[PDB]
């Protein structure tokens, strides 16, 4: 491309919307490529995520674990507007696993509380990837204290299965999963801290134990189950983005499947079907497609189920419509 | 099909084995969809798991860890009646993967000790698929107890590789993969309980490490060597089913390899070729084809050699036929 | 092949050089099957792991962790002297994932020192295959001593993409990661022992966690780092061989992508495209194809992060060339 043409390209700005819900999007792209623009306020700041008042000093990228979703088409180019506030007591930045350079921007990106970058690319490769926040030296700790999210560089003319037809969503829903080290006491309570650094030796020391205290989705234990279930009705499709930005983990949505599952996260590599559970490695993301059958309540979790059960990685859908007694009935139900 | 379409349809008494043999079948599905009847009593009991006696209050669907693989052919409906014997001390159910709708399963088949229920559900999906017992608020615990299994949906036509050609095993073994968390006293020495409830506390602080203390295919280490070593001999096609409900695992065939492997373990996903080792995520069952070219001992091992060979995840195959000096041929054999 | 064919084919002796650079080899073959010949004394020996001194009793192929890369075209013969110097102390053999029987090579290799002996193998598959020792009873603790490598069997006609169309690296590196497990004292302090065997049962205690005190690339922490970064231009295409015999990795290189992943490291499996973060189980070897854009330091890792920046899972490559501000471009730098 030339250097005017770039400069003469529509620019967007968009509206971001927290996890696990999605900003406004199509799935075709609209007109020819675009300079879509977000801005982020990063925020650290304390976040309970367990039932027992547990904390955990965040870094959150516009203010939730994980970061907002963001949405565009290949050979868009992202321009991210980021802010870190003078109210912040530590420097960060941006990767962006979707761009290409300077560490996926991270080296450009470095900002002081008090200071915003502005960082553009060109999101040339389709498919989902995460972005974290990665200052030299201290990368785990930021991505651990919930610094990250991901993005969805859709393919200009959609999603499509193997054999090149149609994938369209009804709706579409971001996991983030989230490994946190919180350091605990002689008597095994959880640890509070004043600042963020003064937790920073102690979270170091379990985090070597490659041993989570929780894992969690949406930044805490329980956040998507109950009222804060996702929803669907039978018949709609559905599109899971799921990411993790620093240890692996195992998708499984309970009562469904993952019926085309791009399990690296990359649309030109071609979607596993019929999935029972899917694997995404730490440092990347995955979406899986899914049209509802069935009605009732789903758990989506992490299928190590101490991980989903034990340490907070499991999440709800609660689905309308009518059962289907062909696909499953209860030819005698519990008796004597 | 309406309800009474299925009552029309064919029925057929199948009698499961123990692994890691499997029920007879055929691999070309003989006639139209049928209702194939399994029965299956669950039994807590106690399993000596390893050479210094220690001790598992296993909760086994037939009696055994794994519960036994069944086979059934895509759109067939597996119709199973489940027993909970009124010796048993807790509730149990059970949930397919292979499934569509409440849980799997699990949510219409929660059974109290003296309690039976049967369920029916249409195989829609073709692969090997994990099931396994999840009761509300004790997922794990069953699941780590070995309550756990898979069955295999095979295609209507058999099975296929990539481009379509026809793969016809001459025989089939299903390996069970569970990963135990058993609790010890003050001296590293693993504790006994006289009763399932009494070692839930204990087993739960040990779970939560992430780290099993034993990790072994069919319910004990050696269980699969010696008087029980898998054979076969040089020119035979052989399958060899893996599941983990739930942590992952690495197959590996020590001196063969995995010609075509469904990682994944669904049948519509082109098969991986020409494998050392593959992967298999907690909370999924996968499967391998192979033709032995070599006689003599191999060994079937989850590939991250501790827990192979110091946490028990190793089993044998014991292989007839003539050695091929074209494929491997000591030149020097070991000397001064 | 008969025993007088194989004789009557060339041989060529092949020097091997070390990790992470690879011995002069063509892409595509030169002329019919050969024996290609290769020569590897095993060398127990001390070996500093990090910058604080910690010591490892080495158990090394060529004298180094990893052992070399061995290469190959798809149906020659690969044919070890493997050596056991009289001034080790323990028997060592050797395994190739890559051959077929006697497990691997294992149960026909067993040397103790002052012995020697001389396998051959027809190399019937193509892809990079994990090579490690295993002496029956000892087997982990030989591979977590370093005592492990790769091959690469390359097709005869040279790499092509899924779809048939060639693949041809300008430069190629070989990544072995290495999990080691050192046992520590009462002060959280590495130790340091006379002789390997003194380290024996302190070790296997540490195996026993699961959770390796250091997990590196070439042998130590920052290996392959500074005047030892690789090297790569814009516009150069880059192999990068990837292994680990113990223990799962994530490799993803930050700033770039895996353009094309052969996750599973083998050939006749179609690789995965534009990857963010690729997936390699223990027991296996994989390979990631990509053509530099950016110029700038890069780094390579294992993506769980506190295994990259705490434990030692971290690569960098120094890549010449022209900034491209198509791609990516800092709009606003940094600034208040
Ligand atoms: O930016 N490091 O993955
Ligand atoms: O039924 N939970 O895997
Ligand atoms: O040779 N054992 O993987
Ligand atoms: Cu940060
Ligand atoms: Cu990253
Ligand atoms: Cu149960
Ligand atoms: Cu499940
Ligand atoms: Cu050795
Ligand atoms: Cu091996």
Not at 2 to 11: D, G, N, Q, V
Not at 66 to 93: A, C, K, R, S, W
Not at 198 to 204: C, G, H, K, M, R
Not at 287 to 313: C, D, K, R, S, W
Request: hydrophobic share 40%; with cysteine.
């Amino acid at each position: 491309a030339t250097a005017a043409e770039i400069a003469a390209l529509p620019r967007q700005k968009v509206e971001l919307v927290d996890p696990p819900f999605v900003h406004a999007h199509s799935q075709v792209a609209e007109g020819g490529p675009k300079v879509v623009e977000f801005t982020m306020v990063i925020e650290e700041k304390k976040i309970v995520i367990d039932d027992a008042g547990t904390e955990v000093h965040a870094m959150a990228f516009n203010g939730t674990v994980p970061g907002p979703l963001m949405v565009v088409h290949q050979d868009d180019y992202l321009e991210l507007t980021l802010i870190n506030p003078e109210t912040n007591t530590l420097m960060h930045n941006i990767d962006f696993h979707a761009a290409t350079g300077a560490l996926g921007g991270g080296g450009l990106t470095e900002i002081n509380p008090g200071e915003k970058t502005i960082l553009r690319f060109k999101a040339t490769k389709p498919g989902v990837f995460v972005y974290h926040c990665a200052p030299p030296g201290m990368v785990p700790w930021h991505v651990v204290s919930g610094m990250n999210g991901a993005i969805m560089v859709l393919p200009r003319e959609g999603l499509h299965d193997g054999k090149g037809k149609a994938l369209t969503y009804d709706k579409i829903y971001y996991v983030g999963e989230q490994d946190f080290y919180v350091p605990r006491d002689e008597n095994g309570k959880y640890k509070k801290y004043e600042a963020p650094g003064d937790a920073y030796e102690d979270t170091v020391k379990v985090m070597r134990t490659l041993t989570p205290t929780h894992v969690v989705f949406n930044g805490a234990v329980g956040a998507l189950t109950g009222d804060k279930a996702m929803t669907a009705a039978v018949g709609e499709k559905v599109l899971i983005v799921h990411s993790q930005a620093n240890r692996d983990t195992r998708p499984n949505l309970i009562g469904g499947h993952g019926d085309y599952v791009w399990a690296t996260g990359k649309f030109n590599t071609p979607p596993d079907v019929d999935q029972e559970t899917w694997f995404i490695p730490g440092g990347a993301a995955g979406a899986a497609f899914y049209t509802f059958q069935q009605p009732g309540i789903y758990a989506y979790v992490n299928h190590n189920l101490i991980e989903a059960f034990e340490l907070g990685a499991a999440a709800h859908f609660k689905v309308t419509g009518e059962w289907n007694d062909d696909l499953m009935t209860s030819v005698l139900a519990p008796s004597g």
